[PDB]
Structure formats: C-alpha cells, structure tokens
Symmetry: C3
Subunit: 334 residues, 3 copies
C-alpha cells in the first residue's frame, strides 16, 4: 500500500559511515537495511582479555544507518541458527511498540522485517531489548548502534547558515563488565549464557572493567587512527546506550555541538567537553586548524587512559604559529 | 500585613497531582499546604526487602505542590510525636534561609509555618536538610518531593505557541542504600536510628542497592501503570534529589523538554533521552501517537531493569501503520 | 615577529581571581603568566588525612587566568629541581599540540614558554597531561586549574543586555583517591611515586574517597567563607577536570548560568542546580537577595556533606520578609 521508491544501503563497519547525501532533492523513499546478529567471543584489550560479545553485523558498535526526515526505514533483522539467544531491535528514532522491540523478537533461525517512519531528526541509539534483565545484558554485551536522521536541507547553525561536513565518523562507546577470579585475573567463558551469572552480579555494582571505543582498547589508534586535514570540517557522532560519557577533542574543540543529538535544536558553539547521556547519541563538528595528533577521549581521564576510552586523529597540514607556538623550548631554569 | 486571598490545596499522593489551572486570570494568592512527616518501615521490592523510610505525607516522593509565579506558598510542616528525629524543609524554589531549612527545624511534637514567594518558574526539588551528615541520610531515606511554579499564562514553546498538557504525572526517583549482611542478604532494622551506621557506610561508597520510582520496584506497573490515549499531551515531571537520572520513554520521545526544569528557558525538542541532574527536577511533554505499552525508564538499563527504575504507560487508541508496521512477522530464514 | 604590547599578570590563589577588566577598550595584547609546579604532601581533612599533591603554583585548584578574546597568552611553566616527576600543561582554551601538552613537557630543573591565541570565549580547564596512565594520576593529584576568556564587550544575557559581575570567585572541585589499609585507615606515603601503585588501583574503581573545594574539607568555610552583600552580582566559576559535578547554591539560584561554560552561547536562566561535565568549567551568576549563610555544594549530598564538597557564603544586608518569612515559629502541635 506504501508506494514510494525503494533504495538499498550497503552498511559499512564503524567508525566509517555508508555513503549518503546531506542536503537532498530526493523526496521520501523506503530505505532498506539488513542487520545480521552475531554472538562471538572477542579480545577487548592488549593483554588478551576475552569477552562474550553480542553484536549487530559483527561490530561494536553496530553500523551507523543514515536517512532523511520523512524516509521510511525498512530493516531486515536476521538471527542465524548459529546464535543461542533470542534478540530484537529497539530504535529510539521510531514511534510505537517499544521502538520496534515488541515487533522484532526472533529466535535463532528466524528473521523479521520492520518499517518505521523517520519523523524526528538527529542521531539516535538503536539496541537489542529482549525483555527484563536481558535488556541491560544484551546492550552491555555490545548490541547497540545508532541511526542518523538528517533534515532534507542538511544541517544548519540555527542562525540560517548551512553546516556541511567533509566527513563523518561514528564513535560508539561501550561499557563492559568482565568479572575477575580470586587471584584478580579476568575470567573467560565458553558461551554468553555461561558468562551471564557472574556478569550480572558485576553489572549491578555499576562499575565497568573496560570502557572502549569501537569494541577494543586502542581500536581507533595506529593504523586505525581517524584522519583529517587542516581546513576539513569533521562530524563526530558519539553514542552510549547505557552510561554517560563526556567527549573531548584534546587540542581542539566542538565548534558546533548537539549534545542531546537532535537537529530540531540549534547547536551550541565553542565547547571544550560535551555530555552524552546514557541511552543517547550526540554529534559534534570541528574544523581542524592545526596538524598533528589529537586524542578524542571521554574526559573521565581514568576511563580514557586506564580503562580504554581513547581514539586518535592524525591530521595533515601546515602548522599555524599565530594560534600556538613554543616561544622557548625546554631549558634549564636560570 | 500581607493581605491577599488565601487558597487551601488538598495534596494528593504521587504520581497524581492536585487539581490546578495552567493559564490563570487569578492574581497572586497565598496558597496553603500542609505536610506531615512520617517515619516508617516499608517494603521496597518484590522479594520483601524492607527499608527505614522517612517521608513527607507518607509517600516517596512527597507530593507535588503546584502554584503560579508570584503566589505566596504557605506551608505548615508537622512533625508528630510518633517520629524519632528532628526534620525541616528546604525548597529549591525559595529565596533565603537555606531554602527555608534554617527556619523550619522541628522536633517530634512540633509544627512550623513558612511562607515564601514563588519568584522563579519551573519544577523544583524540596527536601529535608537538618544539618551535617543528616542531610544526605534524610534525603536518601525518602524525604524529598517537588514543587511546580507555572507562568500565569501557562507553558509555551519559546516561539510564541502555547503548550497545554492534558494531564501531568510526577515521577520521583529515589536512590536507596540498603546494607547486606555477610551471607549477602539485605539487612532489616528496627528504627531509622539503628539503620544509620550501616547505611552511612554504604552511602559513602556511592552505589545504590535500589533505584525506584514512587518508592518501590514496580510501583508504577500493573494496576498502577500510568495511562494515556492517543492524541493526549502528557507532562511528566521527574525529580531526583541526590543523584543523576536519564529519563527515556521507550517507544516515544520528549516532544518538548525542560531538562534543567526551568520555564524561563525554552524547551528543547524531539529528544530521545534527557538528563535530570541530581538535586533538580525536570519536565518533558509528549503527545502519544501509538497505543500499547510503553516503559518509562532511566536509561542506565542496569538501574532500570535490575535495580527498580521502570514505570509503564498503558495507552489506548488506534495503531498507526504509517508510523510503524511489521512488514513481515518472524519467520524461518530462507 | 608578534609585535603587540605585553602585560604581566600577578596570579592570586583561589578562590580569589587576579584583577581584570570585564569590558575593555584595550586591543589584543600578549598577557604573561608564570606557573611554578610544586609537589607536596598536604592535609585534606579535619581528621588529619594526608595526600601526595601535585600542583600549579602550590594550590588546588591552580589559579584562575583571565584574558580577553584575541589576546595571546604566554605562559612560563617552571618545574623546579626539587620535584621528582616530569610535568606539562594542556589548555582546553588553546588550539593544537594537545592543548600545549605536546610542547611543554619539562623535567625537574627545566622551564618552557608556550604562547596560544585566545580564539574561544568562556571558562576552560587547564591541566597536566604527561602521557599515558600518568595523565589521570597527575590530574587527580591536583594538577588542574582554569582560564577565563572574556568577550571584549564583557558578558551579555543573549538578549542584548550586559551582565556585569561585582565580584568573581573560582571554586575548583577535586576528586581524590586515598587508599585505605586493612584496618580501614587512610594510608600515608613518603612520595608521589610511592603512592602511585595503590592510588592507581583505587582510581580504576572510579569511587573517590574525598571530593573537596579549594583542596581540603572545609577550605571555603569559617574565616575563609566566601562573602557577598545583598544586591551584589557574584560570578562563580566552577571547574572539574576529571569527574562530573552538580553545583547548587542552597537558598539561592543561578540567575544566569553557562553550564558548558562557553560565552558564545546564551546563559540559561533561573536554575536550581547546574551540571559541570568532567573535563570542563562552567559559570553561574547570582544577585543576592537575602542576608545570612548560604552553602554552595555539589548536589550529590553524600559528596557534599560526607566527602567534603561544601563551601559557605556569608551575606550581609537586610532581610526581605516579602520573599520569605517564618509565619509561626516552632511550637507544640495543637
Ligand atoms: O538549528 C535548528 C534551529 O534553527 C532554527 C532557526 O533558529 O530553525 C532552522 O532550522 C529548522 C530545522 O532545520 C528549519 O526548519 C528552519 O526553517 C530553520 O530556520 C530554529 O527554529 C531551530 O530550533
Ligand atoms: O519559553 C521561554 C522562552 O520563550 C521566550 C520567547 O522566545 O519568551 C516567552 O516566554 C517568556 C516566559 O514565559 C514570556 O515572558 C515571553 O513573553 C515569551 O515570549 C524567551 O524569551 C524565553 O527564554
Ligand atoms: O549571549 C550570547 C548569545 O547572544 C547573541 C544574541 O542572542 O549574540 C550576542 O552575543 C554575541 C557574543 O558575545 C555578540 O557577538 C552578539 O553581537 C550579541 O548579539 C547570540 O548570537 C549568542 O549565542
Ligand atoms: O575463581 N573464581 O572466583
Ligand atoms: O638546556 N639548558 O638550558
Ligand atoms: O552480619 N552482618 O554483617
Ligand atoms: O515460520 N517459518 O517461516
Ligand atoms: O596494609 N595494607 O593494606
Ligand atoms: O511551644 N509550644 O507551643
Ligand atoms: Cu540481543
Ligand atoms: Cu533504549
Ligand atoms: Cu528529615
Ligand atoms: Cu537541596
Ligand atoms: Cu604533572
Ligand atoms: Cu583535558
């Protein structure tokens, strides 16, 4: 009965984002996505600690889905028979049925197709929510991502000026709860089900063992650093499905920030650190002015440095001595 | 010397709110309220855990008081001789004398009458604050509520359009600290005084055992679910006197949200999750678009599902397939 | 090559702030500051608990630096040979080189000179950040302060009206992590290096032992209470370099609040409690209406009353019975 054009999207793994238009002259379409659930044991730190992850499309976070206001989003959710648990999906961008969760519960071996109309602009969390105590456990096991609903005219500054980004990255932050044994070493488990009792006991004490970006300590460093050039406007979408975060670009700023993540509200300007409320996504754009390495962190510095929550940007371009200069290098005190 | 009309209010137990006007053609009045302190042992979970509660009017939270800007609020606070401790009241809406706390300290068997002028619009916490270490203990024992100070012209969207709610609910969130014994069972105590030493030790570690709405796990579920109909605009006032919270309406949104709770500021629009800073109240309105059950949670999902912080709404009306539809029910993967 | 006038500033210890102009007819200058690092064992509570502090200029927080938009800030950082560790400085107000940290690493016995252009208005954190796990440890050991970058026309309310303060105070909040021994007493250490292993273990559990203003429990009480008079407009700058805080003036309000701390954004009005995201500074102004004592707290009341985070204001002037009055003093219940 809904006769609009259909468009398929090939999702890509974070921190990258599938190709999309900002401002568009397309009218509404039915945009088709597929997410395939994977339960899998993964390594989350450089010491080799393992974790029983549950994921959309094999990644933590799940991929970023991008559509425009008034599009219809049609998702095929697939739970292969190689998984052990039921799963579903709740989109914070959607209206009704617990965000879709009440219409998408699937056992191993099943799939389901949900459509929702994108009536609210901004970045939004999506996550699994099977019911009861399973809800937090599936989310902190990795089953969360985000969807960005853009205005058809693209982003603006709330003073009538367009804000166009040159590139967008999605940084999904994950609080993880890995129990320890008596000697103080992290425990390993053979299945998500086996990890459940010890993991839930730890979860209810509210202190994570690890806080990571893109699923692992150091994920967004080295070869996999984020990149930019001086003069480039970069949008950083940040989500946290369970716990607060306080993003900060060390050596930069948030030139335009939607910390509650919703484009019907004007961005704030010139921030040092912003705040992502647990259960939400937010977005910050910054035009790089200096080359070199930047760190992108949550500014609980214990979490950033000691628990895993640090990404790098490597930026190319020319140094600006007007903005900053070492007037005198380190020398002996007179 | 203050010669204005007097109006008595019959307070009602949360989550309901006493009858009031939004926009009014009344001028300032002296609005009279009575709060009677009750110390009492209560059950806070479905397992039968008990808690030494201290309350205004017998409820957690204390009742919502509603007045208009420029009203004078005259409260009779009563501490019956059946209580064991001194108590007082601090209104965050009031100016001077520690919010009234320095003028309202009463021993068991006494009462006091305070008047304050409502010069600041918004929703505000009130709580007991006797002095020193007693302040946190009385607050986390349940001695907090809220007061809503409306503009005389009612609420607006900051773009000149009136925002009228069809009904208002008050959700008071309480962090509770119940100690455990060596075997890991929650302790019970014979008096608030006896619970104090163990409770304070736990409090200073900053991790609650329970986080509840309306005083108990499941308080706002089942027979006592919140209700609405499709097309109804519902205002949800949320307070947290000690600890942050991140409200979220699962399957809905915050169409207009004052997360810092103050009506001199325009509301933000279209939020997924909002943030109530500990020591504050905030308010969100939403027009329901779909029938069915919704959950209202703090979106630390461990707190919501495992520690008690989940309410339900049951909504009547017609399902809108344009907004959301199950295109294909759960079926075997091809 | 940069030929502007130079101006030296004599920094003062918090909570006071060096003399400055709000609105100025000066053009850009090179403003010169000196910070000398001191590592020292200090007492942080009235019980005599000691702490291995690391400080800029001997204080926690480091002093407030005040400049205007478009000034160049030239800091001489000095690490005397009496210290044991390398140090540096990161200014959140600056652009490039990790905020200056990549250009200012100095061993004991060295100094360095950094210049940065103040292109972003607001209050901003500065802190040490030597690298890796040292970053959180130096910050929570006390190595943080703030810098305020004012518009050249002074502050405004976002509706075209000037906001001029009669005085400004800087309240730096510090989360501290002091380990305990088996009997439950706080440990003392002979050097920062010796405190490191036990302190880091505690830090990673994310629960502070103390949360203080101006470096010690009770620092801003008694002889050292903050002061004002009825009718005075007071700006309170609040910073927290690692952990969130929720400031509240008990018996007052935030008449104009920049909770994200950035003057390119209009202030919010009439707040009860505001939120300082860890890694940021914010600012609130209030015109005092009533005399007497006020407490300024973080409104986690456990932190405020039990962990150290309470300051007082003593305010002189005439009581306003229109705003608040004790209609009937404490008396026996009829
Ligand atoms: O940035 C959103 C913010 O900007 C305003 C103008 O101040 O509206 C702009 O953005 C709207 C949403 O994209 C457009 O519909 C509108 O036409 C444009 O002026 C605000 O109303 C809004 O809060
Ligand atoms: O919603 C409050 C917000 O709206 C504005 C107009 O943008 O003012 C409106 O609300 C005020 C407080 O109720 C009214 O006094 C005013 O007349 C009305 O325009 C903003 O100034 C305010 O921040
Ligand atoms: O308070 C900042 C806020 O006010 C506005 C006007 O609404 O701009 C004012 O402040 C600017 C920064 O100081 C001035 O440049 C401007 O001239 C003045 O109108 C907003 O644009 C700004 O967000
Ligand atoms: O050895 N397990 O606690
Ligand atoms: O390196 N000494 O000046
Ligand atoms: O048995 N009490 O710890
Ligand atoms: O239920 N199987 O298609
Ligand atoms: O005695 N030290 O744990
Ligand atoms: O003090 N009794 O009224
Ligand atoms: Cu799942
Ligand atoms: Cu959710
Ligand atoms: Cu009390
Ligand atoms: Cu209070
Ligand atoms: Cu240092
Ligand atoms: Cu920093």
């Amino acid at each position: 009965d809904l006769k609009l054009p259909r468009q398929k999207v090939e999702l890509v793994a974070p921190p990258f984002v599938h190709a999309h238009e900002q401002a568009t002259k397309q009218g509404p379409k039915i945009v088709e996505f597929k997410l395939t659930i994977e339960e899998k044991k993964v390594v989350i730190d450089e010491k080799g600690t393992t974790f029983q992850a549950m994921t959309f499309n094999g990644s933590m976070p799940g991929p970023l889905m991008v559509v425009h206001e008034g599009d219809y989003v049609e998702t095929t959710l697939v739970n292969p028979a190689t998984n052990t648990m039921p799963h579903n999906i709740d989109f914070h961008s959607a209206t009704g049925a617990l965000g879709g969760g009440a219409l998408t519960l699937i056992n191993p071996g099943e799939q389901v197709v949900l459509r929702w109309k994108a009536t609210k602009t901004g970045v939004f969390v999506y996550h699994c929510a099977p019911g009861g105590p399973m809800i937090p456990w599936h989310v902190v096991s990795g089953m969360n991502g985000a969807v960005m609903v853009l205005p058809r005219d693209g982003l603006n500054d709330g003073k009538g000026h367009a804000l166009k980004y040159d590139k967008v990255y999605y940084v999904g932050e994950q609080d993880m709860y890995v129990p320890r044994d008596e000697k103080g070493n992290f425990k390993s488990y053979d299945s998500p089900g086996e990890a459940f009792t010890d993991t839930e006991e730890m979860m209810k004490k509210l202190i994570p063992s690890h806080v990571v970006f893109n699923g692992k300590v150091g994920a967004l460093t080295g070869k996999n650093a984020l990149t930019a050039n001086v003069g480039e406007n970069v949008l950083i979408v940040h989500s946290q499905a369970n716990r607060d975060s306080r993003p900060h670009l060390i050596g930069g700023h948030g030139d335009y920030v939607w910390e509650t993540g919703k484009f019907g509200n004007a961005p704030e300007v010139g921030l040092e650190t912003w705040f992502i409320r647990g259960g939400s996504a937010g977005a910050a754009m910054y035009k790089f002015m200096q080359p070199g390495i930047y760190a992108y962190v949550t500014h609980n510095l214990i979490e950033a440095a000691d628990l895993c929550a640090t990404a790098h940007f490597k930026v190319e371009g020319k140094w600006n001595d007007d903005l900053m200069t070492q007037v005198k290098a380190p020398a002996e005190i007179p």
